[model samples]
Target: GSHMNPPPPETSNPNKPKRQTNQLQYLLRVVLKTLWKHQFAWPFQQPVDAVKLNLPDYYKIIKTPMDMGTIKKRLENNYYWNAQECIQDFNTMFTNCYIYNKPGDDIVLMAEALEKLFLQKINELPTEE
Candidate 1:
């Protein structure tokens, strides 16, 4: 007398498949990401700075390659004192992120700030769903 579609066949499958990540990558991801979005991020300079280091020597950068994680590391070990400030100091530094390459090219240094734009572009990015 039941006309409704039958339920999915009962199987022993309860737990979902876990993603396989290299353990180092997993832990590194956690530690480095927390470092990046923390309360202390030194601003990236164009040609590098010999003076006015907001952090210690090992944390100083002539220039960073295009990795947010590296910026996170120096800040973590070099600037424990900075953590007392609001984390907004961190977010504002990394927000509206950017990248660049050789000088005199379209992709050059001293690039201007890239503010928020159309959300439609999000889907086209490498990490978008």
Candidate 2:
């Protein structure tokens, strides 16, 4: 008579928790690159210069200034915990533009278009897994 034993169960972690974080970062990077390439992205790429632009009221009207450049830096530095945080900054960037600029201004129009594109891309992000 012979006795046979079954193989031991797999013990290693099948999925590392950090994998999701890396995936999210990759998705955000794609979003940022798309925004950077847009035609209207020029004005929103960098921080607004209130002093050099001679728009003294800009700072006063815009309490929290944000830009794509800052967002990109934050992504690189791992400053954001999730995609929502980065998206909020994008919204702030557009909101600040609307608050400080006239409705009919070209910059405001650019902000509108960029904001729309941003929303579209973010929505396309896979949420299930």
Candidate 3:
């Protein structure tokens, strides 16, 4: 005599239902991917290493140092409730670059270029409801 055992079938409900991707989220995702491909994106792609760069006061000067990596993570994790909040972080990243570097610096110029590109893309997105 042999005993037969059967496992239960996979269930559809795991924890919670998946959230639908909103229009703004999709547009912002596209915009960020495009910006990341730009030549001027190198500097703003990652967080600044003030300690390694020997800028001890960098943190003191720029209270909130934002970067594309951080922004991307925030976007992916649904940290932003609206487009305005996301856009504000982008502006903060650029503003931090502008504040940390002199106007004539190459990094500052790159930030300006990237910021303009971001603005163009953001303007094209439909007004969120």
Using TM-score as the measure, the top candidate is 2
| Candidate 1: regions farther than 4 A off | 1-21, 43-48, 51-129
TM-score (C-alpha) between model 2 and the true structure: 0.78
Clashes (candidate 1) = 0
lDDT, candidate 1, 1-109, per-residue tens: 1222222211223253223233223223443444434333223322122233222332222132222333344333332222212122323333323322234432222
Q: How many residue pairs clash in each candidate?
A: 0, 0, 0
> When superposed on Cα atoms, how far off is each prediction in RMSD?
22.0, 18.0, 13.5
Give the per-residue Cα lDDT of candidate 1 at 1: 17
lDDT for model 3 comes to 0.70
Measure candidate 3: CA RMSD: 13.5
Error of model 1, residue 107, in angstroms: 32
lDDT of 1: 0.29
Give the Cα error of residue 61 in candidate 3, in Å.
0.3
Ranking by TM-score: 2, 3, 1
* TM-score per candidate: 0.21, 0.78, 0.78
Q: Write the per-residue lDDT of candidate 3 for residues 1-129, one digit (tens) a residue.
A: 111212211223335333324644754567788888899898777677665566777777887778887777666655554676667778989998888889979999888888888888877876544
